[model samples]
Target chain A: QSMDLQGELDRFGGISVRLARLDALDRLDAAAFQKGLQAAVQQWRSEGRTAVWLHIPILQSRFIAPAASLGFCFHHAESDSSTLTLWLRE
Target chain B: QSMDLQGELDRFGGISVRLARLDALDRLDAAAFQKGLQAAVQQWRSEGRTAVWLHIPILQSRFIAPAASLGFCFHHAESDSSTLTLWLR
Candidate 1:
């Protein structure tokens, strides 16, 4: 299904990209993961996006360290998960 | 760190157990995961609760199929996550 994020953007005044299939990320090479995150940031910056939410599941703790290294910070935790946010405007 | 699920329970009128360290579950045997889920259901039932939320992150899609098999249903997805809820009431 195609998700029209434009409406969400207009409503929230910002947007976030929820990474899919986190369990599979564990199999990804560390270098590739880091490089991919870098590319995402570059793309968002080019689009004039200021903040991005990296809501990793509690099940994917391995990503916490790498995400933090890339400027994401602890935000909040819910009954089923937790989140990290990167404020690119900073 | 200690989590006080009690306050959350009182505020939301129901309690949810946020499974910490989900990355670790990836290595758990399938049978064990299913057994654990069953046990949790039993406990919740014993408490007389009607519904419980199983908020699995989208990243942990592996658990999605298993969780669905155990009766969890899709609720919603957010920019950073998605959740499933199991109604026992």
Candidate 2:
């Protein structure tokens, strides 16, 4: 998985996203990331997903703001990375 | 902060837990963990928490079963650790 930013579903019917596993992100800078993030959330919403787990490696920190703008909040953080999540269910 | 299993609130009004920060594992085995987890959930519910984030280190994998029995589901995992969660609200 490179730069297309795909994630597998968690057991609870949510998406578990790992940005580190995605490649070609160099082409997916701020603008592209925002678009991709929206598109992915739209897809997830359409799928009726309950939540989204987004893990962003520090190297791709640039994408954090875009994700947050879409309602992802910090779940946890470590020395070099952070995990954010969005609870999609109303 | 050790074995007592404490967590902080996330912006969304949920708990973000890291079991590594909790100490005294030698004392809190399966039985104790079960009671403690139930007690914690009880407290969180009373406080009106929306969710619980449970991070169990590799060494304390034994606690996983009990946590799951209480309704915590998988959030993510690494080679040496895994995170589970309970949606309380």
Candidate 3:
């Protein structure tokens, strides 16, 4: 409910997403999630965002390589979660 | 310049602070930064924040222990930066 229609804006003028607590997690199908993330990247690129910050919890780990394929790389991580970013301009 | 006066709110009902790109970085005196961060934590706690996520760059590493002293712990890090957190609630 807190999430914006587009996405939450980060201080860097990009979007920041916390996958852990998203209300729609239950409906996340792997292929659908991948396609959704893919669609989002394209959408963000068109929005002129410089980057996308993704906070992926352990439960969402399945989407890692899926996201990685789209150029999201590790930003940082913890025992319970991992964070990654896709620099659109890069 | 992009920073919010009250700090950026995160999707998790917490605050997200990117120390690396803060325009105020040049003015950061060690003790001042520490004290400011300390005060901010208390303020956030009063506001009912559940956490404070700090994205600190490598150059700001000196503030590591300063923040750590305030009960911030490592959430993650990269070669150029470190992210720490303080659970305020």
Candidate 4:
């Protein structure tokens, strides 16, 4: 399998963000976790063209899709905005 | 005697975002970084404030206030959308 790292990062400035694992997030409180998640997105977006990355256990297993967020500056390419790819290899 | 920024940033709109230092991040490559931090304000939020900038040995020492992050959507004074803001010594 070929992982197109560049292709993904190229879309959003010169950054390529990917969720590695969800081991550390299994204990996150749903309500509280969402709040934090949203905040991170906004922070990165403020950078303009900067990339945002996130990882969630919800995305593991085909039956379960990873829970992620998106954000970008006003001038963030204005095309793809942000990217949140999920992968489980651990 | 060194800082007095304006609420950090007026949220995360097309305006106020007076930010500052962090010269270098220690774990910029540790644990993938979760692509996380500050809290993560919002995509859009206007402001009438200014950010603070500086130079630090570590990114963890970037800003000087955990303060509060505020961002506005289309038209809302208080939204559930806000990020984090850490501080240093």
Question: In candidate 1, which residue pairs get closer than 3 Å at backbone N, Cα or C atoms, i.e. clash?
Answer: A22-B59, A58-B22, A59-B22, A59-B23
Candidate 2's residue-wise lDDT over B1-89, tens digit each? 32356788889999876766764443455668778788888888999999998876544545665676787756665644557778888
lDDT of 1 at A38: 66
Q: Considering lDDT, which of the candidate structures 1 and 2 is the better prediction for this target?
A: 2
Candidate 4's C-alpha lDDT? 0.26
Ranking by DockQ: 3, 1, 2, 4
Q: TM-score ranking from best to worst?
A: 2, 3, 1, 4
Query: How much is the lDDT of residue A48 in candidate 4?
Result: 52
Best by TM-score: 2
List runs of model 4 lying over 4 Å from the truth.
A1-25, A58-90, B1-89
Please write out the lDDT profile of model 1 over residues B11-81, one tens digit for every residue: 54454644335344545543455566667767667877777665544344445445556776656655344
Residues A1-90, candidate 3: write the lDDT tens digits.
121324678887798877655535445655566677888777888988879888765444555556666767778766556677888875
Off by over 4 Å in 2: A1-4, A24-27, B1-89
- Total backbone clashes of model 2? 6
Question: Which numbered prediction scores highest in lDDT against the true structure?
Answer: 2
Q: Model 1: what is its DockQ?
A: 0.05
- Candidate 2's residue-wise lDDT over A11-77, tens digit each? 8999988876664444456568678778888788998999988876644545655676787766765
True contacts kept of 4: 0.00
Residue B11, candidate 3: alpha-carbon lDDT: 72
DockQ of each: 0.05, 0.02, 0.08, 0.02
Candidate 3: true contacts recovered, fraction:
0.17
Worst 10 residues of 3 chain A by lDDT: A1-10
TM-score of 1: 0.41
- Output the better candidate (1/4) by TM-score: 1
